[PDB]
Amino acid sequence: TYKYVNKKEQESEVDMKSATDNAARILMWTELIRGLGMTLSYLFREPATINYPFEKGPLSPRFRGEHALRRYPSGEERCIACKLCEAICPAQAITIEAEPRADGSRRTTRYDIDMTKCIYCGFCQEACPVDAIVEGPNFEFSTETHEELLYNKEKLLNNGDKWEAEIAANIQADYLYR
Amino acid sequence: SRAEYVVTKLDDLINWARRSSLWPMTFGLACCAVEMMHMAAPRYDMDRFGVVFRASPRQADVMIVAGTLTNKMAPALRKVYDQMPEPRYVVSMGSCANGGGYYHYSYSVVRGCDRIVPVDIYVPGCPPTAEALLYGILQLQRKIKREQKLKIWYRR
Amino acid sequence: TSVKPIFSRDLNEAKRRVRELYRAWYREVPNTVHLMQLDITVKQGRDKVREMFMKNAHVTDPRVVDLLVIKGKMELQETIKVWKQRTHVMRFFHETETPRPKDFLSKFYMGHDP
Amino acid sequence: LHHAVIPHGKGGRSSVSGVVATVFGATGFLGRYVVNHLGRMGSQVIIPYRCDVYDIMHLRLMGDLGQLTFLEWDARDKDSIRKAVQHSNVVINLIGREWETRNFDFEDVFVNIPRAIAQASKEAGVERFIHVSHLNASMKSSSKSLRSKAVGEKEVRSVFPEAIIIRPSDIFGREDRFLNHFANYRWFLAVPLVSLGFKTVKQPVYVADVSKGIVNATKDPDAVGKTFAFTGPNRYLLFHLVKYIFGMTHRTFIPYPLPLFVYSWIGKLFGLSPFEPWTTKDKVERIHISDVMPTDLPGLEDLGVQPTPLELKSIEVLRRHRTYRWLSSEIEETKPAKTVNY
Amino acid sequence: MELVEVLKRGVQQVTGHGGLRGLLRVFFRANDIRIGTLVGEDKYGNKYYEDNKQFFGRHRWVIYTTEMNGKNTFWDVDGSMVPPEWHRWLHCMTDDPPTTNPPTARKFIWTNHKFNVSATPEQYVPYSTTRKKIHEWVPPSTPY
Amino acid sequence: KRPTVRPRSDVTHKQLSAFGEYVAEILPKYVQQVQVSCLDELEICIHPDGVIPTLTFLRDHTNAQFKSLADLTAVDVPTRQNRFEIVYNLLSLRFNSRIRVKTYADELTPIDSIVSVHIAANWYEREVWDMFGVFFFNHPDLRRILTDYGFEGHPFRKDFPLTGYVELRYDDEVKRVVAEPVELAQEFRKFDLNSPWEAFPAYRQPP
Amino acid sequence: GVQVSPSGEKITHTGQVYDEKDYRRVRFVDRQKEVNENFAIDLIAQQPVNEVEHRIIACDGGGGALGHPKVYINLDKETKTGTCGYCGLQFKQH
Ligand SMILES: CCCCCCCCCCCCCCCCCC(=O)OC[C@H](COP(=O)(O)OCCN)OC(=O)CCCCCCCCCCCCCCCCC
Ligand SMILES: NC(=O)C1=CN([C@@H]2O[C@H](COP(=O)(O)OP(=O)(O)OC[C@H]3O[C@@H](n4cnc5c(N)ncnc54)[C@H](OP(=O)(O)O)[C@@H]3O)[C@@H](O)[C@H]2O)C=CC1
Ligand code: SF4
Ligand code: SF4
Ligand code: SF4
Ligand SMILES: [Zn+2]
């Protein structure tokens, strides 16, 4: 079905009353006083803004931000260098170089993320079979140097040891959906 | 009391001025500019901080590279940065401009605005939440707050 | 053998168009060094024109020559107008690339390349 | 020869050369070209600075990720120099003012700071050291700058032999203090010249040639204990040089003579300036002493650089001063300068 | 009437932060006066107030400290100083603060949070986590 | 009836096969290999000389009012000597249907242009020339669109590298955005993903 | 295991440290290198063996869908013990 937006049904009915009304629309700007009144109404409403550093925007557990490399509750490193977080990374941001650890364990000697190539898509954390790399809540990690945004294993593990108290909760909230 | 202390407080004043009034440019290229608009929007209002846009680069104190920088649009960016009158600052916004981003390996992309303009502050994201761009702008304010120019001039 | 033409029955009728294009470029260079304030002399601009022409003198297929004429007319359009800036024009000169050494022993001193 | 020093790549950006270098006057007019030529082919460049971080931003670029490290220092504070040269092969000295200050004199710029850096470099164990004195630098001179540079050129050789001393003539570039200096004499309605500019000879060199020469000196197996005369070709005469400047810059030319003592007094009162002054007594002297014939020193051609003539590069720097009605005017409308051999 | 009641509410706002010192310390520092309920104080100084009669960007807010790790944040404040236990509640991923539903304790979790370090020392510098792959030949220290 | 698979009809297939016979027998001087797919998308393949007549036919014929150009693509297949498969997606708006006309080309066997039929083809022909190197006769402008002005190369050709042959950056020596050759700090990592097992016997190529 | 080298740099769990002559120590001037102090080798060594009764058991992390895939480990050997591939926990039977 369709409908017309600017098609007059039919014309040619005018008397002195309608002429007066149109001539008073003109010469008084009556359809402009309505815009003035609208903007005046908006002057007396509560503004939608927030004192940002002190009160902030609402986010959800699914929110995907800064990355982190997680650990088990035993402190054991949770990644195993299965090397598919970089298989699927559609920006080729992730590199891995892996070896046995001298304990006899599949673990990494390298986990880099050029966060200037990352598109923050979540594919790595929904591809990891062990919930090792995640995309956490921190969106406030701006820098004054390009080289700082090129991460490695130690920075990601620092993030994990920092944000575990948040990431564990976000995961607890969002699983049963993923 | 001391000339050095007077110089320090004067520099604090000039930094306060340039920090409480930094006028960015209407220069947005790609999706990241939408989050710049959202920062301009009511929730994260920029004019609250003295940060209002100006269209001409000569009436501007900062430029925000909110989008992907291509080989065809780099001369224009550099002309604009040049035409901006010093003191001037740059904010690279988004993965496409910090580095090459999701278009790093393509034939028509410069792999960072670092190669064309000198960046003061990098904001990551694809897109960066306007919350995050705002954090980066206040971080640039903090950077201006510690410039120590007249101090070093006195110490020349 | 037994192929279709484009704009050229033969190679001489293509060299005709080639010379028309060389002519347009020769007559355009003094205006391009003036309109957009290049920092070169008209002599070396026209030498660059002849260089980028003799970069393709080995060719004998008329069709390739016609396509090169077409692309030259495109670049001439872009240059007659100011669709392209000083950057693009001075791109031709390679004012920053060090000369590729055309000698064996230099290549051996730096790099595994032939 | 550490494996990280091996030169990989096709000689360009994102490659490696083995030229880990400190550039001390990096925040200036020549240091920017040196850093650009070092980063263009791939080489880490430590940049010690005292200026604000605002005045190192044009240097923040011109290098792939990591190949540009900045760190602050103080010439008064030793233990800020070993910090820099502890990790390098090469050390390049480009420090020098054109005027004294209440803090730093000429000795304390051209003698004591090179000597300090050279002691620190001989202790650290770097392989090369490029010093940059002047062509006219001699202990028997009229200018304090030149005599101080002679003293430093001698003392650096004493304390750090196996050094390299480059002696350029008056350099010209986009933000020089030579051609722009002559061109900025139009705000005053006439240009003074001692003896009308005659009996004074100038052999000026382009910046990029000096930079390429330094950048090859840090790679050539020769040039280990040797001086250099980075002069450029085409010895010009000062009157005709200024005339070429004022023809390229299409303004006018109203020259007139002026004795050295009154022009020196003018330089002094202009040097009473807390900011970067315009003219000074030593600048006047250095302008009005001829360039030495370099016929007994190697030069650029013995190091891998063809000197670019000033008639090829002058418009790039002097178009800034042209008015409308003359801005869109070409190099072939300036009747080039008469030369000399002497 | 109601004008008098809003004036009373403003009087309470003016007079619920201690005194003039305590009022200016919040007004010159956060540009707001709105009084709320103290949810809990952090182990650095942060306060984390709440007032659910407002709308869904202001029902929760922070009042930062004046010294976090020897940095003097009386003026230079940043959002990186909210630790993760309160980040989740402040960005409204929960209706459950850590004073009632705290997080799990772990030996490897950081005790002391760190704000953003970008220009300071003790910032981040990347490096190859790997090792030498192609080993060289060390010649002998004797001749012939 | 099966939920996971896509539903299937036959009336669209029959209609499009009928219309394919229609075009095939009405326009035999040009037409090759009419085909209709499992998904019912009619697809007529044409000699390059037949472009204007076929497109004018499908635009202006009464039982085929294909008077809207949706896409105009090209597809590089280096194997076949006539590389570039050129595609014309159309729709009718009178019969609520689409059709696809196809031709072929090469680096030196160009094609007549279509602005005399579909003005929408102007910028698409420009894009195709820029990306693949197919020249179009009697075109008004026929300059680049998408590539930089000083650009040598036809990027969407399969023999063109993804990263290109030139890279840009600003230089203080000359104060321009110079173009240096290409030198990446991280080579693109080509992944060999194709499995060594026949997944679809229906498309099995015999030797 | 954050023992240092004689060059003063911390050494990582991937024993990585730069040589003394390696010029790449510059980047840690007026700076430091991020290294994680909590090594997983020593930590998972600081974990006892979970004795069991059967010769074959399973291991997930402990959350179920929050750990790792279920794997079974044989415990017939007595001289040594079982070990999980994903985690590093150990098991034995009496
Ligand atoms: C005793 C017998 C004798 C008595 C003699 C007196 C007889 C009565 C005279 C009444 C005349 C009133 C003046 C009217 C002038 C305007 C004329 C007019 O027609 O409107 C002009 C313009 C036209 O609008 P349009 O719809 O396009 O119609 C034109 C078609 N030809 O419409 C516009 O101008 C609108 C564009 C301008 C918008 C600007 C924003 C206006 C905002 C309103 C603010 C009002 C505040 C005024 C306060 C003034 C205080 C000093
Ligand atoms: N026309 C020319 O340029 C000529 C130059 N030369 C030689 O070239 C070299 C540099 O030339 P130019 O680049 O023009 O000099 P500039 O004045 O252009 O820059 C000099 C550098 O020295 C640094 N500097 C000066 N004084 C001090 C100090 N007291 N403590 C620390 N750093 C200091 C400055 O750093 P900041 O700005 O941070 O103080 C500045 O970057 C000098 O050796 C000079 O003799 C020789 C002949 C001609
Ligand atoms: S997918 Fe997970 S376990 Fe596999 S390499 Fe990536 S982070 Fe490690
Ligand atoms: S979020 Fe996406 S783009 Fe970013 S690292 Fe993970 S897979 Fe790569
Ligand atoms: S970084 Fe992401 S959001 Fe920003 S311009 Fe690039 S693709 Fe768009
Ligand atoms: Zn397990």
Side-chain angles (χ1 to χ4, degrees), chain A residues 21-140:
Chain A
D21 306 354
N22 215 43
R25 186 179 60 71
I26 303 144
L27 315 176
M28 306 296 151
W29 310 327
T30 306
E31 83 302 340
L32 311 195
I33 314 315
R34 306 187 69 167
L36 294 185
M38 211 81 234
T39 42
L40 197 76
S41 53
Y42 263 91
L43 181 76
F44 295 102
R45 305 190 198 190
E46 185 82 42
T49 191
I50 61 186
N51 273 112
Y52 163 65
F54 310 93
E55 71 210 0
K56 297 171 122 180
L59 275 302
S60 64
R62 291 185 185 184
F63 176 74
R64 63 198 188 205
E66 190 170 33
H67 285 270
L69 276 168
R70 298 187 74 210
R71 296 148 159 289
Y72 282 111
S74 59
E76 174 50 276
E77 174 186 334
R78 192 180 275 257
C79 173
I80 46 169
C82 77
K83 286 191 79 169
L84 53 90
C85 46
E86 53 162 29
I88 189 156
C89 185
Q92 282 206 346
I94 298 161
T95 69
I96 297 103
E97 283 184 41
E99 263 177 14
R101 194 155 74 176
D103 213 334
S105 183
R106 198 188 174 100
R107 287 302 190 296
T108 41
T109 49
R110 185 171 202 160
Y111 209 91
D112 305 332
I113 309 194
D114 203 336
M115 298 287 275
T116 61
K117 295 186 224 177
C118 174
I119 53 151
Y120 303 87
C121 77
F123 288 18
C124 45
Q125 58 165 7
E126 72 208 52
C128 189
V130 293
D131 295 14
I133 191 168
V134 294
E135 215 176 341
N138 202 58
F139 51 87
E140 280 157 349

Side-chain angles (χ1 to χ4, degrees), chain D residues 10 13-14 36 40 62, chain F residues 169 171-174 183 185:
Chain D
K10 273 213 180 87
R13 206 189 191 70
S14 314
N36 182 40
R40 185 270 307 282
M62 65 160 86
Chain F
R169 58 98 176 173
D171 180 15
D172 293 334
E173 196 210 340
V174 310
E183 202 153 10

Side-chain angles (χ1 to χ4, degrees), chain D residues 193-232:
Chain D
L193 293 163
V194 168
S195 305
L196 209 75
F198 300 87
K199 301 191 277 282
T200 312
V201 181
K202 286 276 165 253
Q203 201 180 359
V205 70
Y206 192 41
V207 185
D209 301 334
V210 174
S211 88
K212 291 169 194 113
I214 296 152
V215 165
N216 307 330
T218 178
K219 290 182 87 164
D220 205 49
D222 309 350
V224 285
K226 293 167 72 166
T227 49
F228 282 93
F230 282 12
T231 42

Side-chain angles (χ1 to χ4, degrees), chain F residues 106-131:
Chain F
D106 203 38
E107 301 106 330
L108 321 167
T109 54
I111 312 184
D112 291 356
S113 48
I114 276 156
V115 175
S116 63
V117 193
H118 291 293
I119 288 155
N122 189 299
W123 282 23
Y124 280 119
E125 288 158 7
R126 275 175 65 185
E127 183 181 347
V128 171
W129 152 255
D130 208 5
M131 289 289 114

Side-chain angles (χ1 to χ4, degrees), chain A residues 54, chain B residues 145, chain E residues 21-30 63-68 70-78 81:
Chain A
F54 310 93
Chain B
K145 177 159 179 178
Chain E
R21 167 70 148 281
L23 173 58
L24 306 158
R25 203 193 203 88
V26 169
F27 179 54
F28 294 155
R29 207 173 165 277
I63 281 153
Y64 289 88
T65 87
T66 78
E67 180 158 316
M68 205 197 180
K71 196 252 172 165
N72 181 31
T73 69
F74 197 93
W75 297 119
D76 290 352
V77 169
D78 44 354
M81 314 207 295

